[PDB]
Amino acid sequence: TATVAEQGEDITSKKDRGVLKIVKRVGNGEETPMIGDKVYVHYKGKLSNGKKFDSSHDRNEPFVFSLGKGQVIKAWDIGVATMKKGEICHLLCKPEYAYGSAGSLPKIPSNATLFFEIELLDFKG
């Protein structure tokens, strides 16, 4: 959490450090997904203390959503839009870009900063 916090790129429009990104593995081809594209991801999500809250690897079934439709937390609609096919990145996500004051109890407390490792497997129109 400390390294992405210190070295992560702010990819928010507001520049409020709400979503910070580090690329861990480059993708293939230059294209990123468009809004409404179906995106297919594998991910691991941990709280700031490093405790796991979720992973698509538990069932090993990719997580699928339409980009930009609010089907996922704001940090993902923002962050996955920046990713190339096959890319793996780390995203640090302040609560305003995730579950806010409500949290997602019991797994995710109120005002939780979240850390994700996300692999963009594929995307389709």
Residues with catalytic annotation?
A: 43, 53-54, 73, 99, 116
CA dist., res. 80 & res. 87, Å (int): 10
| Beta pairing partners, 92 | 20, 115
Task: Report CA torsion sign: 99, 89, 79, 118.
Answer: negative
- Amino acid in the structure at residue 91: L
H/E stretch holding 10 = strand 9-10
For 26-53, the DSSP string reads --SSS--PPTT-EEEEEEEEEETTS-EE
Spatial CB neighbours of 96, under 8 Å, sequence gap ≥ 6: 16, 18, 74
